[PDB]
């Protein structure tokens, strides 16, 4: 009965597809849009099952939205809207990365054309982000409890306290970054979040900084997961994120589940 829910029962063979079962259209948003700097929309086409909730998604320091492009298709494809953004400048700082996160989902509430502005459901955004745009997913969460869900991918930040978080937070972590590494950014970063909020730690095995910005079944198929679970209320995902999984691609996992 779940009005969020959209597509077929998932398989550990749809979630890990790099083509879900919607198919994707696209919208280029030019860099003089106030308050960020553009990007690329990628949104489902059918419209048979309903509006879809969003995600902004952020690169990281001196990056840009080039990084960051495979997750526009392999997401949307699931059914979601997704925003690969630029930055105002490359380099911004996570702070201002949350900020602008925030001005991309409210652009696609506020000023989006036809096409996407009626697909879209404004009551459930999420974000997204990599490296300091990871900390600028951790920030936006801080700006605006109301978000669905969020995503830190290798984040990085100065603050490593971030105990007033209400929102679902999934950390990706990377065993042998070197530019955030996870004994001093993801794993404190994770620690510091309450107790009582849903939320994960995925640490993936022999992986470096640049991880997420290749193609990555892995960070796919629980990406993918707590999107569902969370934008979406779909419990049908609950299987997959909970108990914590066990890929060899993974060398530690944490969570607050059951969820
Ligand atoms: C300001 O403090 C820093 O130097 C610094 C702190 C954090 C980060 P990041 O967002 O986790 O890195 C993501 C992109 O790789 C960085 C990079 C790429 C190419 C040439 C030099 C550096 C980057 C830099
Ligand atoms: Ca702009
Ligand atoms: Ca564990
Ligand atoms: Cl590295």
Known sequence: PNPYERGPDPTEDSIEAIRGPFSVATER???????????????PRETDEGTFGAVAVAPGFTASQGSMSWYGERVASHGFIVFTIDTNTRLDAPGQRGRQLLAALDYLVERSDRKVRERLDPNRLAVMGHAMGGGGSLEATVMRPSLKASIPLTPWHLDKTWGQVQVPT???????????????????????????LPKAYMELCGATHFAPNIPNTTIAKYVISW?????????????????????????????????
Do not use: M
């Open 29 to 43: 948003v030019s860099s003089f849009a106030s308050g960020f700097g553009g990007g690329t929309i990628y949104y």
């Open 170 to 196: 999934f950390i990706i972590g990377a065993e042998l970054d070197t530019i955030a590494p996870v004994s001093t950014h993801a794993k404190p970063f994770y620690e510091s979040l309450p107790s009582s």
């Open 227 to 259: 999107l569902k679970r969370f934008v979406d209320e779909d419990t049908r995902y609950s299987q997959f994120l909970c108990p914590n999984p066990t890929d060899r691609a993974i060398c530690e996992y944490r969570s607050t589940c059951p969820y």
